[PDB]
JSON list of N, CA and C and ligand atoms in Angstrom, two decimals:
[
{"chain": "A", "resi": 1, "resn": "UNK", "atom": "N", "xyz": [29.46, 16.10, 29.45]},
{"chain": "A", "resi": 1, "resn": "UNK", "atom": "CA", "xyz": [28.00, 16.07, 29.38]},
{"chain": "A", "resi": 1, "resn": "UNK", "atom": "C", "xyz": [27.45, 17.19, 30.24]},
{"chain": "A", "resi": 2, "resn": "UNK", "atom": "N", "xyz": [26.89, 18.21, 29.60]},
{"chain": "A", "resi": 2, "resn": "UNK", "atom": "CA", "xyz": [26.38, 19.39, 30.30]},
{"chain": "A", "resi": 2, "resn": "UNK", "atom": "C", "xyz": [24.95, 19.66, 29.85]},
{"chain": "A", "resi": 3, "resn": "UNK", "atom": "N", "xyz": [24.35, 20.69, 30.44]},
{"chain": "A", "resi": 3, "resn": "UNK", "atom": "CA", "xyz": [22.98, 21.05, 30.11]},
{"chain": "A", "resi": 3, "resn": "UNK", "atom": "C", "xyz": [22.86, 21.79, 28.78]},
{"chain": "A", "resi": 4, "resn": "UNK", "atom": "N", "xyz": [23.93, 22.42, 28.30]},
{"chain": "A", "resi": 4, "resn": "UNK", "atom": "CA", "xyz": [23.92, 23.07, 27.00]},
{"chain": "A", "resi": 4, "resn": "UNK", "atom": "C", "xyz": [24.25, 22.12, 25.86]},
{"chain": "A", "resi": 5, "resn": "UNK", "atom": "N", "xyz": [24.63, 20.88, 26.17]},
{"chain": "A", "resi": 5, "resn": "UNK", "atom": "CA", "xyz": [24.87, 19.86, 25.16]},
{"chain": "A", "resi": 5, "resn": "UNK", "atom": "C", "xyz": [23.73, 18.85, 25.05]},
{"chain": "A", "resi": 6, "resn": "UNK", "atom": "N", "xyz": [22.95, 18.66, 26.11]},
{"chain": "A", "resi": 6, "resn": "UNK", "atom": "CA", "xyz": [21.85, 17.71, 26.12]},
{"chain": "A", "resi": 6, "resn": "UNK", "atom": "C", "xyz": [20.55, 18.44, 26.47]},
{"chain": "A", "resi": 7, "resn": "UNK", "atom": "N", "xyz": [19.44, 17.74, 26.27]},
{"chain": "A", "resi": 7, "resn": "UNK", "atom": "CA", "xyz": [18.12, 18.26, 26.59]},
{"chain": "A", "resi": 7, "resn": "UNK", "atom": "C", "xyz": [17.31, 17.18, 27.30]},
{"chain": "A", "resi": 8, "resn": "UNK", "atom": "N", "xyz": [16.35, 17.64, 28.11]},
{"chain": "A", "resi": 8, "resn": "UNK", "atom": "CA", "xyz": [15.54, 16.77, 28.96]},
{"chain": "A", "resi": 8, "resn": "UNK", "atom": "C", "xyz": [14.21, 16.52, 28.26]},
{"chain": "A", "resi": 9, "resn": "UNK", "atom": "N", "xyz": [13.77, 15.26, 28.28]},
{"chain": "A", "resi": 9, "resn": "UNK", "atom": "CA", "xyz": [12.46, 14.88, 27.74]},
{"chain": "A", "resi": 9, "resn": "UNK", "atom": "C", "xyz": [12.06, 13.56, 28.36]},
{"chain": "A", "resi": 10, "resn": "UNK", "atom": "N", "xyz": [10.94, 13.55, 29.08]},
{"chain": "A", "resi": 10, "resn": "UNK", "atom": "CA", "xyz": [10.47, 12.32, 29.69]},
{"chain": "A", "resi": 10, "resn": "UNK", "atom": "C", "xyz": [11.29, 11.94, 30.91]},
{"chain": "A", "resi": 11, "resn": "UNK", "atom": "N", "xyz": [11.33, 10.63, 31.16]},
{"chain": "A", "resi": 11, "resn": "UNK", "atom": "CA", "xyz": [12.05, 10.07, 32.29]},
{"chain": "A", "resi": 11, "resn": "UNK", "atom": "C", "xyz": [12.83, 8.84, 31.82]},
{"chain": "A", "resi": 12, "resn": "UNK", "atom": "N", "xyz": [13.60, 8.25, 32.74]},
{"chain": "A", "resi": 12, "resn": "UNK", "atom": "CA", "xyz": [14.43, 7.10, 32.40]},
{"chain": "A", "resi": 12, "resn": "UNK", "atom": "C", "xyz": [13.63, 5.81, 32.28]},
{"chain": "A", "resi": 13, "resn": "UNK", "atom": "N", "xyz": [12.31, 5.86, 32.42]},
{"chain": "A", "resi": 13, "resn": "UNK", "atom": "CA", "xyz": [11.48, 4.66, 32.39]},
{"chain": "A", "resi": 13, "resn": "UNK", "atom": "C", "xyz": [10.91, 4.37, 31.00]},
{"chain": "A", "resi": 14, "resn": "UNK", "atom": "N", "xyz": [11.26, 5.16, 29.99]},
{"chain": "A", "resi": 14, "resn": "UNK", "atom": "CA", "xyz": [10.73, 4.98, 28.64]},
{"chain": "A", "resi": 14, "resn": "UNK", "atom": "C", "xyz": [11.81, 4.54, 27.66]},
{"chain": "A", "resi": 15, "resn": "UNK", "atom": "N", "xyz": [13.03, 5.04, 27.82]},
{"chain": "A", "resi": 15, "resn": "UNK", "atom": "CA", "xyz": [14.11, 4.74, 26.88]},
{"chain": "A", "resi": 15, "resn": "UNK", "atom": "C", "xyz": [14.70, 3.38, 27.21]},
{"chain": "A", "resi": 16, "resn": "UNK", "atom": "N", "xyz": [14.78, 2.51, 26.21]},
{"chain": "A", "resi": 16, "resn": "UNK", "atom": "CA", "xyz": [15.37, 1.19, 26.37]},
{"chain": "A", "resi": 16, "resn": "UNK", "atom": "C", "xyz": [16.89, 1.30, 26.22]},
{"chain": "A", "resi": 17, "resn": "UNK", "atom": "N", "xyz": [17.61, 0.96, 27.28]},
{"chain": "A", "resi": 17, "resn": "UNK", "atom": "CA", "xyz": [19.06, 1.01, 27.26]},
{"chain": "A", "resi": 17, "resn": "UNK", "atom": "C", "xyz": [19.67, 2.26, 27.85]},
{"chain": "A", "resi": 18, "resn": "UNK", "atom": "N", "xyz": [18.91, 3.04, 28.62]},
{"chain": "A", "resi": 18, "resn": "UNK", "atom": "CA", "xyz": [19.44, 4.26, 29.21]},
{"chain": "A", "resi": 18, "resn": "UNK", "atom": "C", "xyz": [20.36, 3.91, 30.37]},
{"chain": "A", "resi": 19, "resn": "UNK", "atom": "N", "xyz": [21.50, 4.60, 30.43]},
{"chain": "A", "resi": 19, "resn": "UNK", "atom": "CA", "xyz": [22.49, 4.39, 31.48]},
{"chain": "A", "resi": 19, "resn": "UNK", "atom": "C", "xyz": [22.37, 5.51, 32.50]},
{"chain": "A", "resi": 20, "resn": "UNK", "atom": "N", "xyz": [22.75, 5.20, 33.74]},
{"chain": "A", "resi": 20, "resn": "UNK", "atom": "CA", "xyz": [22.66, 6.16, 34.83]},
{"chain": "A", "resi": 20, "resn": "UNK", "atom": "C", "xyz": [24.01, 6.85, 35.03]},
{"chain": "A", "resi": 21, "resn": "UNK", "atom": "N", "xyz": [24.01, 8.17, 34.92]},
{"chain": "A", "resi": 21, "resn": "UNK", "atom": "CA", "xyz": [25.22, 8.98, 35.02]},
{"chain": "A", "resi": 21, "resn": "UNK", "atom": "C", "xyz": [24.84, 10.33, 35.62]},
{"chain": "A", "resi": 22, "resn": "UNK", "atom": "N", "xyz": [25.72, 11.32, 35.47]},
{"chain": "A", "resi": 22, "resn": "UNK", "atom": "CA", "xyz": [25.48, 12.66, 35.98]},
{"chain": "A", "resi": 22, "resn": "UNK", "atom": "C", "xyz": [25.54, 13.67, 34.84]},
{"chain": "A", "resi": 23, "resn": "UNK", "atom": "N", "xyz": [24.78, 14.75, 34.99]},
{"chain": "A", "resi": 23, "resn": "UNK", "atom": "CA", "xyz": [24.77, 15.85, 34.04]},
{"chain": "A", "resi": 23, "resn": "UNK", "atom": "C", "xyz": [25.15, 17.12, 34.78]},
{"chain": "A", "resi": 24, "resn": "UNK", "atom": "N", "xyz": [26.22, 17.77, 34.34]},
{"chain": "A", "resi": 24, "resn": "UNK", "atom": "CA", "xyz": [26.73, 18.96, 35.01]},
{"chain": "A", "resi": 24, "resn": "UNK", "atom": "C", "xyz": [25.87, 20.17, 34.67]},
{"chain": "A", "resi": 25, "resn": "UNK", "atom": "N", "xyz": [25.53, 20.95, 35.69]},
{"chain": "A", "resi": 25, "resn": "UNK", "atom": "CA", "xyz": [24.75, 22.17, 35.51]},
{"chain": "A", "resi": 25, "resn": "UNK", "atom": "C", "xyz": [25.64, 23.38, 35.71]},
{"chain": "A", "resi": 26, "resn": "UNK", "atom": "N", "xyz": [25.89, 24.19, 34.67]},
{"chain": "A", "resi": 26, "resn": "UNK", "atom": "CA", "xyz": [26.77, 25.36, 34.85]},
{"chain": "A", "resi": 26, "resn": "UNK", "atom": "C", "xyz": [26.19, 26.42, 35.77]},
{"chain": "A", "resi": 27, "resn": "UNK", "atom": "N", "xyz": [24.90, 26.35, 36.10]},
{"chain": "A", "resi": 27, "resn": "UNK", "atom": "CA", "xyz": [24.28, 27.36, 36.95]},
{"chain": "A", "resi": 27, "resn": "UNK", "atom": "C", "xyz": [24.58, 27.13, 38.43]},
{"chain": "A", "resi": 28, "resn": "UNK", "atom": "N", "xyz": [24.84, 25.88, 38.82]},
{"chain": "A", "resi": 28, "resn": "UNK", "atom": "CA", "xyz": [25.06, 25.54, 40.23]},
{"chain": "A", "resi": 28, "resn": "UNK", "atom": "C", "xyz": [26.30, 26.22, 40.81]},
{"chain": "A", "resi": 29, "resn": "UNK", "atom": "N", "xyz": [27.48, 26.13, 40.18]},
{"chain": "A", "resi": 29, "resn": "UNK", "atom": "CA", "xyz": [28.65, 26.80, 40.77]},
{"chain": "A", "resi": 29, "resn": "UNK", "atom": "C", "xyz": [28.55, 28.32, 40.74]},
{"chain": "A", "resi": 30, "resn": "UNK", "atom": "N", "xyz": [27.76, 28.88, 39.83]},
{"chain": "A", "resi": 30, "resn": "UNK", "atom": "CA", "xyz": [27.56, 30.32, 39.80]},
{"chain": "A", "resi": 30, "resn": "UNK", "atom": "C", "xyz": [26.64, 30.79, 40.91]},
{"chain": "A", "resi": 31, "resn": "UNK", "atom": "N", "xyz": [25.64, 29.99, 41.27]},
{"chain": "A", "resi": 31, "resn": "UNK", "atom": "CA", "xyz": [24.68, 30.36, 42.30]},
{"chain": "A", "resi": 31, "resn": "UNK", "atom": "C", "xyz": [25.14, 30.00, 43.70]},
{"chain": "A", "resi": 32, "resn": "UNK", "atom": "N", "xyz": [26.00, 28.99, 43.84]},
{"chain": "A", "resi": 32, "resn": "UNK", "atom": "CA", "xyz": [26.49, 28.62, 45.16]},
{"chain": "A", "resi": 32, "resn": "UNK", "atom": "C", "xyz": [27.39, 29.71, 45.74]},
{"chain": "A", "resi": 33, "resn": "UNK", "atom": "N", "xyz": [28.15, 30.39, 44.89]},
{"chain": "A", "resi": 33, "resn": "UNK", "atom": "CA", "xyz": [29.04, 31.45, 45.35]},
{"chain": "A", "resi": 33, "resn": "UNK", "atom": "C", "xyz": [28.32, 32.80, 45.35]},
{"chain": "B", "resi": 1, "resn": "UNK", "atom": "N", "xyz": [6.43, 27.46, 27.28]},
{"chain": "B", "resi": 1, "resn": "UNK", "atom": "CA", "xyz": [7.09, 28.55, 26.57]},
{"chain": "B", "resi": 1, "resn": "UNK", "atom": "C", "xyz": [8.06, 29.24, 27.53]},
{"chain": "B", "resi": 2, "resn": "UNK", "atom": "N", "xyz": [9.36, 29.06, 27.29]},
{"chain": "B", "resi": 2, "resn": "UNK", "atom": "CA", "xyz": [10.40, 29.61, 28.14]},
{"chain": "B", "resi": 2, "resn": "UNK", "atom": "C", "xyz": [11.40, 30.38, 27.28]},
{"chain": "B", "resi": 3, "resn": "UNK", "atom": "N", "xyz": [12.38, 30.98, 27.96]},
{"chain": "B", "resi": 3, "resn": "UNK", "atom": "CA", "xyz": [13.46, 31.68, 27.27]},
{"chain": "B", "resi": 3, "resn": "UNK", "atom": "C", "xyz": [14.39, 30.72, 26.53]},
{"chain": "B", "resi": 4, "resn": "UNK", "atom": "N", "xyz": [14.53, 29.48, 27.01]},
{"chain": "B", "resi": 4, "resn": "UNK", "atom": "CA", "xyz": [15.34, 28.48, 26.33]},
{"chain": "B", "resi": 4, "resn": "UNK", "atom": "C", "xyz": [14.67, 27.92, 25.08]},
{"chain": "B", "resi": 5, "resn": "UNK", "atom": "N", "xyz": [13.39, 28.24, 24.85]},
{"chain": "B", "resi": 5, "resn": "UNK", "atom": "CA", "xyz": [12.68, 27.82, 23.65]},
{"chain": "B", "resi": 5, "resn": "UNK", "atom": "C", "xyz": [12.43, 28.95, 22.67]},
{"chain": "B", "resi": 6, "resn": "UNK", "atom": "N", "xyz": [12.44, 30.20, 23.13]},
{"chain": "B", "resi": 6, "resn": "UNK", "atom": "CA", "xyz": [12.15, 31.35, 22.30]},
{"chain": "B", "resi": 6, "resn": "UNK", "atom": "C", "xyz": [13.31, 32.34, 22.34]},
{"chain": "B", "resi": 7, "resn": "UNK", "atom": "N", "xyz": [13.42, 33.13, 21.27]},
{"chain": "B", "resi": 7, "resn": "UNK", "atom": "CA", "xyz": [14.41, 34.19, 21.19]},
{"chain": "B", "resi": 7, "resn": "UNK", "atom": "C", "xyz": [13.71, 35.54, 21.02]},
{"chain": "B", "resi": 8, "resn": "UNK", "atom": "N", "xyz": [14.39, 36.59, 21.48]},
{"chain": "B", "resi": 8, "resn": "UNK", "atom": "CA", "xyz": [13.84, 37.94, 21.52]},
{"chain": "B", "resi": 8, "resn": "UNK", "atom": "C", "xyz": [14.46, 38.75, 20.39]},
{"chain": "B", "resi": 9, "resn": "UNK", "atom": "N", "xyz": [13.61, 39.36, 19.57]},
{"chain": "B", "resi": 9, "resn": "UNK", "atom": "CA", "xyz": [14.06, 40.26, 18.51]},
{"chain": "B", "resi": 9, "resn": "UNK", "atom": "C", "xyz": [12.96, 41.26, 18.23]},
{"chain": "B", "resi": 10, "resn": "UNK", "atom": "N", "xyz": [13.27, 42.55, 18.38]},
{"chain": "B", "resi": 10, "resn": "UNK", "atom": "CA", "xyz": [12.25, 43.56, 18.21]},
{"chain": "B", "resi": 10, "resn": "UNK", "atom": "C", "xyz": [11.36, 43.65, 19.44]},
{"chain": "B", "resi": 11, "resn": "UNK", "atom": "N", "xyz": [10.12, 44.08, 19.21]},
{"chain": "B", "resi": 11, "resn": "UNK", "atom": "CA", "xyz": [9.13, 44.22, 20.27]},
{"chain": "B", "resi": 11, "resn": "UNK", "atom": "C", "xyz": [7.76, 43.86, 19.71]},
{"chain": "B", "resi": 12, "resn": "UNK", "atom": "N", "xyz": [6.75, 43.93, 20.58]},
{"chain": "B", "resi": 12, "resn": "UNK", "atom": "CA", "xyz": [5.39, 43.58, 20.20]},
{"chain": "B", "resi": 12, "resn": "UNK", "atom": "C", "xyz": [4.70, 44.67, 19.40]},
{"chain": "B", "resi": 13, "resn": "UNK", "atom": "N", "xyz": [5.38, 45.78, 19.12]},
{"chain": "B", "resi": 13, "resn": "UNK", "atom": "CA", "xyz": [4.80, 46.88, 18.37]},
{"chain": "B", "resi": 13, "resn": "UNK", "atom": "C", "xyz": [5.00, 46.76, 16.86]},
{"chain": "B", "resi": 14, "resn": "UNK", "atom": "N", "xyz": [5.70, 45.73, 16.40]},
{"chain": "B", "resi": 14, "resn": "UNK", "atom": "CA", "xyz": [6.01, 45.54, 14.99]},
{"chain": "B", "resi": 14, "resn": "UNK", "atom": "C", "xyz": [5.31, 44.32, 14.42]},
{"chain": "B", "resi": 15, "resn": "UNK", "atom": "N", "xyz": [5.40, 43.18, 15.10]},
{"chain": "B", "resi": 15, "resn": "UNK", "atom": "CA", "xyz": [4.85, 41.94, 14.58]},
{"chain": "B", "resi": 15, "resn": "UNK", "atom": "C", "xyz": [3.34, 41.95, 14.71]},
{"chain": "B", "resi": 16, "resn": "UNK", "atom": "N", "xyz": [2.65, 41.59, 13.63]},
{"chain": "B", "resi": 16, "resn": "UNK", "atom": "CA", "xyz": [1.19, 41.60, 13.60]},
{"chain": "B", "resi": 16, "resn": "UNK", "atom": "C", "xyz": [0.67, 40.29, 14.18]},
{"chain": "B", "resi": 17, "resn": "UNK", "atom": "N", "xyz": [-0.30, 40.38, 15.08]},
{"chain": "B", "resi": 17, "resn": "UNK", "atom": "CA", "xyz": [-0.93, 39.21, 15.65]},
{"chain": "B", "resi": 17, "resn": "UNK", "atom": "C", "xyz": [-0.33, 38.71, 16.95]},
{"chain": "B", "resi": 18, "resn": "UNK", "atom": "N", "xyz": [0.54, 39.49, 17.58]},
{"chain": "B", "resi": 18, "resn": "UNK", "atom": "CA", "xyz": [1.16, 39.06, 18.83]},
{"chain": "B", "resi": 18, "resn": "UNK", "atom": "C", "xyz": [0.18, 39.27, 19.98]},
{"chain": "B", "resi": 19, "resn": "UNK", "atom": "N", "xyz": [0.15, 38.32, 20.91]},
{"chain": "B", "resi": 19, "resn": "UNK", "atom": "CA", "xyz": [-0.76, 38.36, 22.05]},
{"chain": "B", "resi": 19, "resn": "UNK", "atom": "C", "xyz": [0.06, 38.35, 23.33]},
{"chain": "B", "resi": 20, "resn": "UNK", "atom": "N", "xyz": [-0.59, 38.73, 24.43]},
{"chain": "B", "resi": 20, "resn": "UNK", "atom": "CA", "xyz": [0.08, 38.84, 25.72]},
{"chain": "B", "resi": 20, "resn": "UNK", "atom": "C", "xyz": [0.03, 37.52, 26.48]},
{"chain": "B", "resi": 21, "resn": "UNK", "atom": "N", "xyz": [1.14, 37.21, 27.15]},
{"chain": "B", "resi": 21, "resn": "UNK", "atom": "CA", "xyz": [1.25, 36.01, 27.97]},
{"chain": "B", "resi": 21, "resn": "UNK", "atom": "C", "xyz": [2.45, 36.19, 28.89]},
{"chain": "B", "resi": 22, "resn": "UNK", "atom": "N", "xyz": [2.70, 35.18, 29.73]},
{"chain": "B", "resi": 22, "resn": "UNK", "atom": "CA", "xyz": [3.85, 35.17, 30.63]},
{"chain": "B", "resi": 22, "resn": "UNK", "atom": "C", "xyz": [4.79, 34.05, 30.22]},
{"chain": "B", "resi": 23, "resn": "UNK", "atom": "N", "xyz": [6.09, 34.36, 30.19]},
{"chain": "B", "resi": 23, "resn": "UNK", "atom": "CA", "xyz": [7.12, 33.40, 29.83]},
{"chain": "B", "resi": 23, "resn": "UNK", "atom": "C", "xyz": [7.88, 33.00, 31.09]},
{"chain": "B", "resi": 24, "resn": "UNK", "atom": "N", "xyz": [7.93, 31.70, 31.37]},
{"chain": "B", "resi": 24, "resn": "UNK", "atom": "CA", "xyz": [8.59, 31.21, 32.57]},
{"chain": "B", "resi": 24, "resn": "UNK", "atom": "C", "xyz": [10.10, 31.18, 32.36]},
{"chain": "B", "resi": 25, "resn": "UNK", "atom": "N", "xyz": [10.83, 31.78, 33.29]},
{"chain": "B", "resi": 25, "resn": "UNK", "atom": "CA", "xyz": [12.29, 31.79, 33.25]},
{"chain": "B", "resi": 25, "resn": "UNK", "atom": "C", "xyz": [12.83, 30.82, 34.28]},
{"chain": "B", "resi": 26, "resn": "UNK", "atom": "N", "xyz": [13.48, 29.73, 33.88]},
{"chain": "B", "resi": 26, "resn": "UNK", "atom": "CA", "xyz": [13.99, 28.76, 34.87]},
{"chain": "B", "resi": 26, "resn": "UNK", "atom": "C", "xyz": [15.08, 29.32, 35.76]},
{"chain": "B", "resi": 27, "resn": "UNK", "atom": "N", "xyz": [15.69, 30.46, 35.39]},
{"chain": "B", "resi": 27, "resn": "UNK", "atom": "CA", "xyz": [16.76, 31.02, 36.20]},
{"chain": "B", "resi": 27, "resn": "UNK", "atom": "C", "xyz": [16.22, 31.70, 37.46]},
{"chain": "B", "resi": 28, "resn": "UNK", "atom": "N", "xyz": [14.99, 32.21, 37.39]},
{"chain": "B", "resi": 28, "resn": "UNK", "atom": "CA", "xyz": [14.45, 33.00, 38.50]},
{"chain": "B", "resi": 28, "resn": "UNK", "atom": "C", "xyz": [14.18, 32.17, 39.75]},
{"chain": "B", "resi": 29, "resn": "UNK", "atom": "N", "xyz": [13.51, 31.00, 39.69]},
{"chain": "B", "resi": 29, "resn": "UNK", "atom": "CA", "xyz": [13.31, 30.23, 40.92]},
{"chain": "B", "resi": 29, "resn": "UNK", "atom": "C", "xyz": [14.61, 29.72, 41.53]},
{"chain": "B", "resi": 30, "resn": "UNK", "atom": "N", "xyz": [15.63, 29.48, 40.70]},
{"chain": "B", "resi": 30, "resn": "UNK", "atom": "CA", "xyz": [16.92, 29.07, 41.23]},
{"chain": "B", "resi": 30, "resn": "UNK", "atom": "C", "xyz": [17.66, 30.24, 41.87]},
{"chain": "B", "resi": 31, "resn": "UNK", "atom": "N", "xyz": [17.52, 31.44, 41.30]},
{"chain": "B", "resi": 31, "resn": "UNK", "atom": "CA", "xyz": [18.18, 32.61, 41.87]},
{"chain": "B", "resi": 31, "resn": "UNK", "atom": "C", "xyz": [17.52, 33.05, 43.16]},
{"chain": "B", "resi": 32, "resn": "UNK", "atom": "N", "xyz": [16.19, 32.94, 43.24]},
{"chain": "B", "resi": 32, "resn": "UNK", "atom": "CA", "xyz": [15.48, 33.36, 44.45]},
{"chain": "B", "resi": 32, "resn": "UNK", "atom": "C", "xyz": [15.77, 32.42, 45.61]},
{"chain": "B", "resi": 33, "resn": "UNK", "atom": "N", "xyz": [15.93, 31.13, 45.34]},
{"chain": "B", "resi": 33, "resn": "UNK", "atom": "CA", "xyz": [16.22, 30.15, 46.38]},
{"chain": "B", "resi": 33, "resn": "UNK", "atom": "C", "xyz": [17.69, 30.19, 46.78]},
{"chain": "C", "resi": 1, "resn": "NAG", "atom": "C1", "xyz": [20.17, 4.16, 37.80]},
{"chain": "C", "resi": 1, "resn": "NAG", "atom": "O1", "xyz": [20.09, 3.40, 36.58]},
{"chain": "C", "resi": 1, "resn": "NAG", "atom": "C2", "xyz": [20.06, 1.98, 36.80]},
{"chain": "C", "resi": 1, "resn": "NAG", "atom": "C3", "xyz": [20.12, 1.33, 35.43]},
{"chain": "C", "resi": 1, "resn": "NAG", "atom": "O2", "xyz": [19.08, 0.37, 35.28]},
{"chain": "C", "resi": 1, "resn": "NAG", "atom": "C4", "xyz": [18.82, 1.60, 37.59]},
{"chain": "C", "resi": 1, "resn": "NAG", "atom": "O3", "xyz": [18.83, 0.20, 37.84]},
{"chain": "C", "resi": 1, "resn": "NAG", "atom": "C5", "xyz": [18.78, 2.36, 38.91]},
{"chain": "C", "resi": 1, "resn": "NAG", "atom": "O4", "xyz": [17.55, 2.11, 39.58]},
{"chain": "C", "resi": 1, "resn": "NAG", "atom": "C6", "xyz": [18.94, 3.86, 38.67]},
{"chain": "C", "resi": 1, "resn": "NAG", "atom": "N1", "xyz": [18.89, 4.63, 39.92]},
{"chain": "C", "resi": 1, "resn": "NAG", "atom": "C7", "xyz": [19.74, 4.62, 40.96]},
{"chain": "C", "resi": 1, "resn": "NAG", "atom": "C8", "xyz": [20.94, 3.70, 40.88]},
{"chain": "C", "resi": 1, "resn": "NAG", "atom": "O5", "xyz": [19.56, 5.33, 41.94]}
]
């Protein structure tokens, strides 16, 4: 589950049945170094 | 209106009816920080 596979819209307070997990950002390891 | 929503092809000298605006790049605030 990455940012190029999913898209952001709204918040977790609207979707019925949303699970809490993590989404990997490919920009973070490139910018940390 | 961002780069992840629009694609670049040609320039503003060809397409009729193009207007000037600013496009927000999400990479820039992350790179500056
Ligand atoms: C994560 O999702 C669960 C699912 O309902 C929620 O209860 C919780 O408040 C969310 N946030 C957390 C665990 O920080």
